[PDB]
C-alpha cells in the first residue's frame, strides 16, 4: 500500500508565504485522499508492487480500466510528494541548477517571469513545472494531476495551481501566491533532482 | 460589450448555504474577470455583435486565434450568468421540471444522489449540469468552463465545482457544498429554462 508521507517540516514552517491552515488541509485531506483512492485501484492487482514513478512514467501500460485513477490519484500522490520536498524554510538561490537556469534564461529573474507567466495563464486546475528534457531545462504546464514524467520529461520543481493550494490566503490572486513561492523553494533539493536527471 | 450582470438577490441572501464573502469574490472577481477577458478578445472584431449563446453553441466556427478565449472566458461568462439565476433565497421544490424529474428518476432524492455522485467525482475544475437532450433530461459534467450547449444539449441547471466556488466555507468538503446547494435552487427559473428547451 502507498502511504501519505509526513511533511519534512512543521505545518507553520513556510509562514508567512504558505499559511499553516492551508498546509494542514492540503497535506492531511487532499493528498491523503489521492493516496486512499490510488490504493483502492491498485489493491490486489499487479500494480500494488509497482513503484509510483514507474506507473506514472508508464501510464500507457496501466490497463485501461485502472488508467484514469492511476493517472488522477497516482498523479495526485506523485505530484504532492514532490511538492512538499521542493519547499523549504531555508531557500537559497544557488547551486548547479541555478547556474544552468541562468545560462539558458540569462538571469534567474527572466526564468521566474516565464514560470510566472505560464503559472498565471494556466486555465483550470493544474501544475507548472521545471523539467529536464534530454539534458535541457524547460518550463511546461500540465492539467489536473498530469505529470511531465509520463511524456519522458523529468520534473525537478513544481508549483501547484489548483485553487485549494492558495485560495484560503490569496483567493483569486494567484500571482501573489506565485510571488510568495519563490521565497520557499528548496533549491538544494531541486539541484539534487537536476543533477540526477540531466 | 458584455456586462457583468448583478446578482438578483443580496450578497448574503443565500446564507447559511453560500457565504457572503464567497459570493463577493465569486461574482465581483471571478465572474468579472471572465467578462473582462471575453471583451478583450471580442472588442472591435466580427464577434462583437454575435450572441454569447450562439458562439458557445458554435465554438468550432469561432476563428482559431479567438477560440480558446471564447471557450474559456465566454464559457465562464455564460456559466456564471446561468448559475446566479438558478439560485434563490426562497427555494421551493415544485414545478413541471420537478414532476418530470420524479417521473424519470422515481424520486427527487434519487435524482439528487445521481447529481451529487457526478459532481463529487468530477476531477479538477468544472460544472455539473441538468440538460435537455432531444426532449429528455440528463445529468452530465463539463471540464473547466465548457458548456453542454457546445454538444447540442440545453443546460437548465448547473453547479460550479471549481474550488473557488466552495473553498472558503467548505475547504475540501465538496459534498457538504453540494448538500447546501439544494436548499437554494430556484426551481421556477429551472422550470422556465426547461419549458423553452423541451
Ligand atoms: Mn494540491
Ligand atoms: Mn465559478
Amino acid at each position: 500500500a502507498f502511504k501519505l508521507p509526513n511533511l519534512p517540516y512543521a505545518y507553520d514552517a513556510l509562514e508567512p508565504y504558505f499559511d499553516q491552515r492551508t498546509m494542514e488541509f492540503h497535506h492531511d485531506k487532499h493528498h491523503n485522499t489521492y493516496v486512499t483512492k490510488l490504493n483502492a485501484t491498485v489493491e490486489g492487482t499487479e500494480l500494488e508492487h509497482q513503484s509510483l514513478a514507474d506507473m506514472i512514467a508508464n501510464l500507457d501500460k496501466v490497463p485501461e480500466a485502472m488508467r484514469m485513477s492511476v493517472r488522477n490519484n497516482g498523479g495526485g500522490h506523485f505530484n504532492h510528494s514532490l511538492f512538499w520536498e521542493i519547499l523549504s524554510p531555508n531557500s537559497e538561490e544557488k547551486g548547479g541548477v541555478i547556474d544552468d537556469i541562468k545560462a539558458q534564461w540569462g538571469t534567474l529573474d527572466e526564468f521566474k517571469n516565464e514560470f510566472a507567466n505560464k503559472a498565471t495563464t494556466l486555465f483550470g486546475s493544474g501544475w507548472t513545472w521545471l523539467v529536464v528534457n534530454d539534458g535541457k531545462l524547460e518550463i511546461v504546464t500540465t492539467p489536473n494531476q498530469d505529470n511531465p514524467l509520463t511524456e519522458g520529461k523529468t520534473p525537478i520543481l513544481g508549483l501547484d495551481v489548483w485553487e485549494h493550494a492558495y485560495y484560503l490566503k490569496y483567493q483569486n490572486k494567484r500571482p501573489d501566491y506565485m510571488t510568495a513561492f519563490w521565497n520557499i523553494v528548496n533549491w538544494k533539493k531541486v539541484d539534487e533532482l537536476y543533477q540526477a536527471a540531466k
Side-chain angles (χ1 to χ4, degrees), chain A:
Chain A
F2 295 95
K3 287 152 206 191
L4 176 70
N6 295 128
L7 293 178
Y9 37 69
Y11 292 100
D12 69 333
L14 308 177
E15 290 282 5
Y17 306 106
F18 280 12
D19 55 302
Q20 183 187 317
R21 185 174 182 220
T22 295
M23 292 297 296
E24 295 167 348
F25 285 104
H26 201 183
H27 175 270
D28 305 337
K29 307 308 177 158
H30 293 271
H31 189 177
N32 192 240
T33 293
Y34 298 127
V35 172
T36 308
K37 292 185 132 314
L38 175 68
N39 286 328
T41 298
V42 308
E43 273 151 14
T45 77
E46 258 197 346
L47 279 63
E48 193 163 39
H49 291 78
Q50 179 178 6
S51 83
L52 186 60
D54 193 71
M55 69 186 37
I56 296 307
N58 295 293
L59 188 56
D60 62 291
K61 293 169 193 190
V62 172
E64 179 198 7
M66 299 169 216
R67 197 174 307 140
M68 192 57 70
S69 178
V70 170
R71 175 179 189 172
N72 293 343
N73 302 303
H77 182 30
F78 184 84
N79 295 345
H80 292 87
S81 291
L82 181 42
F83 195 51
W84 318 128
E85 290 288 332
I86 60 70
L87 304 168
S88 171
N90 306 126
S91 191
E92 282 185 29
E93 293 170 334
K94 66 177 196 197
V97 66
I98 291 283
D99 300 341
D100 293 359
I101 286 161
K102 295 180 182 206
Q104 204 177 292
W105 276 271
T107 71
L108 191 60
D109 206 70
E110 285 304 314
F111 166 79
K112 288 177 183 164
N113 289 342
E114 182 179 324
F115 196 102
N117 170 262
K118 288 180 172 184
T120 58
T121 57
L122 194 167
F123 196 73
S125 302
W127 289 77
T128 304
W129 307 98
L130 183 53
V131 305
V132 178
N133 185 13
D134 198 29
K136 310 159 210 304
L137 293 163
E138 208 181 1
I139 298 168
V140 297
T141 62
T142 55
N144 302 320
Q145 302 299 346
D146 292 3
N147 192 282
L149 193 64
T150 302
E151 302 317 296
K153 301 179 192 205
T154 301
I156 67 171
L157 174 63
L159 181 72
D160 187 0
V161 298
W162 288 59
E163 293 177 313
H164 68 240
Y166 64 84
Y167 211 77
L168 296 184
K169 186 168 170 77
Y170 297 107
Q171 298 84 52
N172 68 298
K173 305 190 292 334
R174 195 194 284 176
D176 290 351
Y177 167 69
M178 171 80 283
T179 296
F181 173 75
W182 301 118
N183 294 283
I184 53 170
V185 172
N186 191 354
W187 286 107
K188 190 172 167 293
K189 183 52 169 199
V190 178
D191 190 56
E192 282 160 33
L193 294 181
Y194 176 60
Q195 298 307 324
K198 70 185 208 194

mmCIF file of all heavy atoms in Angstrom, chain A residues 7 17 19 31 36 40 57 63 66 72 74-75 85-86 96 99 115 121 129 148 169 174 180 186 190 197:
data_model
loop_
_atom_site.group_PDB
_atom_site.id
_atom_site.type_symbol
_atom_site.label_atom_id
_atom_site.label_comp_id
_atom_site.label_asym_id
_atom_site.label_seq_id
_atom_site.Cartn_x
_atom_site.Cartn_y
_atom_site.Cartn_z
ATOM 1 N N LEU A 7 5.173 15.453 6.113
ATOM 2 C CA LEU A 7 5.944 16.631 5.721
ATOM 3 C C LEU A 7 7.346 16.603 6.333
ATOM 4 O O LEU A 7 7.516 16.122 7.454
ATOM 5 C CB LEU A 7 5.252 17.918 6.195
ATOM 6 C CG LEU A 7 3.923 18.278 5.553
ATOM 7 C CD1 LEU A 7 3.394 19.551 6.201
ATOM 8 C CD2 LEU A 7 4.096 18.430 4.041
ATOM 9 N N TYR A 17 4.520 32.752 3.952
ATOM 10 C CA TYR A 17 4.331 32.625 2.498
ATOM 11 C C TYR A 17 3.208 31.651 2.159
ATOM 12 O O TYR A 17 2.274 31.990 1.401
ATOM 13 C CB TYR A 17 5.655 32.210 1.829
ATOM 14 C CG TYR A 17 6.756 33.153 2.195
ATOM 15 C CD1 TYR A 17 7.737 32.775 3.101
ATOM 16 C CD2 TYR A 17 6.774 34.460 1.697
ATOM 17 C CE1 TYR A 17 8.730 33.663 3.501
ATOM 18 C CE2 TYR A 17 7.772 35.351 2.078
ATOM 19 C CZ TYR A 17 8.747 34.930 2.970
ATOM 20 O OH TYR A 17 9.730 35.764 3.381
ATOM 21 N N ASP A 19 0.357 29.513 4.213
ATOM 22 C CA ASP A 19 -0.273 29.522 5.526
ATOM 23 C C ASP A 19 -0.398 28.110 6.117
ATOM 24 O O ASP A 19 -0.604 27.114 5.394
ATOM 25 C CB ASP A 19 -1.649 30.200 5.454
ATOM 26 C CG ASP A 19 -2.573 29.564 4.399
ATOM 27 O OD1 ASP A 19 -2.221 29.513 3.174
ATOM 28 O OD2 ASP A 19 -3.671 29.096 4.766
ATOM 29 N N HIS A 31 -4.003 15.467 -0.198
ATOM 30 C CA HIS A 31 -3.013 14.440 -0.530
ATOM 31 C C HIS A 31 -3.453 13.047 -0.023
ATOM 32 O O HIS A 31 -3.393 12.032 -0.754
ATOM 33 C CB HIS A 31 -1.623 14.863 -0.050
ATOM 34 C CG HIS A 31 -0.518 13.983 -0.522
ATOM 35 N ND1 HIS A 31 0.798 14.244 -0.238
ATOM 36 C CD2 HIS A 31 -0.523 12.848 -1.267
ATOM 37 C CE1 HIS A 31 1.563 13.312 -0.770
ATOM 38 N NE2 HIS A 31 0.778 12.445 -1.397
ATOM 39 N N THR A 36 -5.537 7.261 -0.749
ATOM 40 C CA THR A 36 -6.559 6.274 -0.454
ATOM 41 C C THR A 36 -7.245 5.761 -1.723
ATOM 42 O O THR A 36 -7.478 4.554 -1.886
ATOM 43 C CB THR A 36 -7.602 6.868 0.501
ATOM 44 O OG1 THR A 36 -6.932 7.448 1.649
ATOM 45 C CG2 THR A 36 -8.490 5.826 0.972
ATOM 46 N N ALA A 40 -7.220 2.106 -3.538
ATOM 47 C CA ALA A 40 -8.484 1.452 -3.922
ATOM 48 C C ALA A 40 -8.392 0.833 -5.312
ATOM 49 O O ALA A 40 -8.964 -0.230 -5.576
ATOM 50 C CB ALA A 40 -9.628 2.453 -3.887
ATOM 51 N N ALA A 57 5.402 7.134 -15.209
ATOM 52 C CA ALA A 57 6.192 7.126 -16.431
ATOM 53 C C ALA A 57 5.549 6.268 -17.489
ATOM 54 O O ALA A 57 5.585 6.633 -18.664
ATOM 55 C CB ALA A 57 7.641 6.647 -16.182
ATOM 56 N N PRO A 63 -3.453 -1.068 -17.300
ATOM 57 C CA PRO A 63 -4.655 -1.497 -18.031
ATOM 58 C C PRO A 63 -5.748 -0.421 -18.064
ATOM 59 O O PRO A 63 -5.901 0.364 -17.111
ATOM 60 C CB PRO A 63 -5.135 -2.726 -17.258
ATOM 61 C CG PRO A 63 -3.887 -3.268 -16.613
ATOM 62 C CD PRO A 63 -3.100 -2.033 -16.237
ATOM 63 N N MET A 66 -8.016 0.718 -15.143
ATOM 64 C CA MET A 66 -7.354 1.343 -13.990
ATOM 65 C C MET A 66 -6.670 2.660 -14.340
ATOM 66 O O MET A 66 -6.251 3.405 -13.447
ATOM 67 C CB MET A 66 -6.314 0.393 -13.389
ATOM 68 C CG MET A 66 -6.892 -0.925 -12.863
ATOM 69 S SD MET A 66 -5.564 -2.084 -12.487
ATOM 70 C CE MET A 66 -6.364 -3.599 -12.988
ATOM 71 N N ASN A 72 -4.995 10.072 -12.321
ATOM 72 C CA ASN A 72 -5.528 11.155 -11.455
ATOM 73 C C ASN A 72 -5.068 11.047 -9.998
ATOM 74 O O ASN A 72 -4.498 11.996 -9.442
ATOM 75 C CB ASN A 72 -7.068 11.236 -11.557
ATOM 76 C CG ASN A 72 -7.573 11.694 -12.926
ATOM 77 O OD1 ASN A 72 -6.833 12.258 -13.766
ATOM 78 N ND2 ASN A 72 -8.857 11.461 -13.159
ATOM 79 N N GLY A 74 -2.873 8.557 -8.679
ATOM 80 C CA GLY A 74 -1.430 8.297 -8.691
ATOM 81 C C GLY A 74 -0.711 9.595 -9.012
ATOM 82 O O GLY A 74 0.243 9.968 -8.327
ATOM 83 N N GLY A 75 -1.182 10.325 -10.026
ATOM 84 C CA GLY A 75 -0.631 11.692 -10.274
ATOM 85 C C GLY A 75 -0.693 12.598 -9.047
ATOM 86 O O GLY A 75 0.287 13.281 -8.707
ATOM 87 N N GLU A 85 8.633 18.165 -0.932
ATOM 88 C CA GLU A 85 10.088 18.042 -0.868
ATOM 89 C C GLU A 85 10.811 19.258 -1.478
ATOM 90 O O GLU A 85 11.941 19.551 -1.092
ATOM 91 C CB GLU A 85 10.571 16.731 -1.529
ATOM 92 C CG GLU A 85 10.204 15.446 -0.737
ATOM 93 C CD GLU A 85 11.011 15.240 0.566
ATOM 94 O OE1 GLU A 85 12.183 15.707 0.669
ATOM 95 O OE2 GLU A 85 10.514 14.577 1.556
ATOM 96 N N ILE A 86 10.167 19.946 -2.413
ATOM 97 C CA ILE A 86 10.801 21.120 -3.031
ATOM 98 C C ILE A 86 10.472 22.444 -2.352
ATOM 99 O O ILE A 86 10.891 23.497 -2.837
ATOM 100 C CB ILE A 86 10.668 21.160 -4.579
ATOM 101 C CG1 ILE A 86 9.217 21.183 -5.078
ATOM 102 C CG2 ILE A 86 11.445 19.969 -5.147
ATOM 103 C CD1 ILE A 86 8.451 22.469 -4.828
ATOM 104 N N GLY A 96 24.231 24.257 -8.811
ATOM 105 C CA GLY A 96 24.381 23.920 -10.211
ATOM 106 C C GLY A 96 23.163 24.238 -11.058
ATOM 107 O O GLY A 96 23.289 24.821 -12.144
ATOM 108 N N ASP A 99 22.908 27.908 -11.670
ATOM 109 C CA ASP A 99 23.859 28.308 -12.711
ATOM 110 C C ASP A 99 23.364 27.978 -14.132
ATOM 111 O O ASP A 99 23.501 28.802 -15.051
ATOM 112 C CB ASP A 99 25.225 27.650 -12.506
ATOM 113 C CG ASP A 99 25.862 28.018 -11.187
ATOM 114 O OD1 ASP A 99 25.462 29.030 -10.579
ATOM 115 O OD2 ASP A 99 26.777 27.285 -10.770
ATOM 116 N N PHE A 115 8.172 31.370 -15.903
ATOM 117 C CA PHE A 115 7.479 30.460 -14.972
ATOM 118 C C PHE A 115 6.155 31.079 -14.483
ATOM 119 O O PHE A 115 5.091 30.447 -14.561
ATOM 120 C CB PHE A 115 8.385 30.107 -13.801
ATOM 121 C CG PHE A 115 7.940 28.932 -13.037
ATOM 122 C CD1 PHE A 115 8.549 27.692 -13.205
ATOM 123 C CD2 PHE A 115 6.873 29.040 -12.150
ATOM 124 C CE1 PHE A 115 8.111 26.586 -12.497
ATOM 125 C CE2 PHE A 115 6.434 27.931 -11.424
ATOM 126 C CZ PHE A 115 7.077 26.700 -11.595
ATOM 127 N N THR A 121 -1.382 31.965 -16.411
ATOM 128 C CA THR A 121 -2.320 31.761 -17.545
ATOM 129 C C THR A 121 -2.895 30.330 -17.608
ATOM 130 O O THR A 121 -3.754 30.052 -18.435
ATOM 131 C CB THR A 121 -1.709 32.093 -18.934
ATOM 132 O OG1 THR A 121 -0.544 31.302 -19.131
ATOM 133 C CG2 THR A 121 -1.333 33.563 -19.012
ATOM 134 N N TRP A 129 5.659 23.315 -14.137
ATOM 135 C CA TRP A 129 6.854 22.529 -13.859
ATOM 136 C C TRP A 129 8.107 23.092 -14.527
ATOM 137 O O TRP A 129 8.031 23.600 -15.684
ATOM 138 C CB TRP A 129 6.696 21.124 -14.397
ATOM 139 C CG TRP A 129 5.496 20.406 -13.987
ATOM 140 C CD1 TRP A 129 4.344 20.282 -14.698
ATOM 141 C CD2 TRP A 129 5.301 19.679 -12.774
ATOM 142 N NE1 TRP A 129 3.446 19.501 -14.011
ATOM 143 C CE2 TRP A 129 3.997 19.123 -12.825
ATOM 144 C CE3 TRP A 129 6.090 19.431 -11.656
ATOM 145 C CZ2 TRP A 129 3.460 18.367 -11.786
ATOM 146 C CZ3 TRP A 129 5.552 18.666 -10.612
ATOM 147 C CH2 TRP A 129 4.239 18.137 -10.699
ATOM 148 N N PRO A 148 4.687 15.612 -16.289
ATOM 149 C CA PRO A 148 5.518 15.515 -17.476
ATOM 150 C C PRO A 148 6.370 14.228 -17.588
ATOM 151 O O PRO A 148 6.821 13.878 -18.670
ATOM 152 C CB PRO A 148 6.480 16.724 -17.346
ATOM 153 C CG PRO A 148 5.798 17.662 -16.450
ATOM 154 C CD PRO A 148 5.130 16.741 -15.445
ATOM 155 N N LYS A 169 -5.600 31.806 1.648
ATOM 156 C CA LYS A 169 -4.791 33.028 1.898
ATOM 157 C C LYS A 169 -4.933 34.103 0.807
ATOM 158 O O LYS A 169 -4.933 35.317 1.111
ATOM 159 C CB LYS A 169 -3.299 32.681 2.053
ATOM 160 C CG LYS A 169 -2.433 33.870 2.458
ATOM 161 C CD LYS A 169 -1.045 33.394 2.881
ATOM 162 C CE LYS A 169 -0.077 34.548 3.048
ATOM 163 N NZ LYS A 169 -0.364 35.221 4.316
ATOM 164 N N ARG A 174 -3.836 34.612 -7.649
ATOM 165 C CA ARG A 174 -2.842 33.598 -7.950
ATOM 166 C C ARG A 174 -1.413 34.202 -8.113
ATOM 167 O O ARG A 174 -0.445 33.557 -7.721
ATOM 168 C CB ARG A 174 -3.234 32.782 -9.179
ATOM 169 C CG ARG A 174 -2.441 31.487 -9.317
ATOM 170 C CD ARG A 174 -2.579 30.855 -10.686
ATOM 171 N NE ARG A 174 -3.857 30.186 -10.862
ATOM 172 C CZ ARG A 174 -4.261 29.621 -11.996
ATOM 173 N NH1 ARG A 174 -3.491 29.632 -13.089
ATOM 174 N NH2 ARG A 174 -5.434 29.019 -12.043
ATOM 175 N N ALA A 180 4.983 34.626 -3.570
ATOM 176 C CA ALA A 180 5.309 34.043 -2.261
ATOM 177 C C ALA A 180 6.199 32.810 -2.418
ATOM 178 O O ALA A 180 7.180 32.657 -1.703
ATOM 179 C CB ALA A 180 4.032 33.712 -1.513
ATOM 180 N N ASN A 186 13.076 24.995 -2.222
ATOM 181 C CA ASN A 186 14.235 24.228 -1.788
ATOM 182 C C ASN A 186 15.158 23.964 -2.975
ATOM 183 O O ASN A 186 15.129 22.898 -3.568
ATOM 184 C CB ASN A 186 13.784 22.903 -1.144
ATOM 185 C CG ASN A 186 14.922 22.178 -0.438
ATOM 186 O OD1 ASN A 186 16.091 22.581 -0.509
ATOM 187 N ND2 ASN A 186 14.569 21.112 0.287
ATOM 188 N N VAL A 190 16.004 20.759 -5.481
ATOM 189 C CA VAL A 190 15.837 20.881 -6.944
ATOM 190 C C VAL A 190 17.174 20.522 -7.618
ATOM 191 O O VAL A 190 17.207 19.773 -8.615
ATOM 192 C CB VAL A 190 15.399 22.316 -7.353
ATOM 193 C CG1 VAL A 190 15.268 22.462 -8.868
ATOM 194 C CG2 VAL A 190 14.085 22.709 -6.695
ATOM 195 N N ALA A 197 18.948 13.936 -13.146
ATOM 196 C CA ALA A 197 18.187 13.843 -14.399
ATOM 197 C C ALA A 197 18.913 14.338 -15.660
ATOM 198 O O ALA A 197 18.598 13.876 -16.750
ATOM 199 C CB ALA A 197 16.867 14.576 -14.241
#
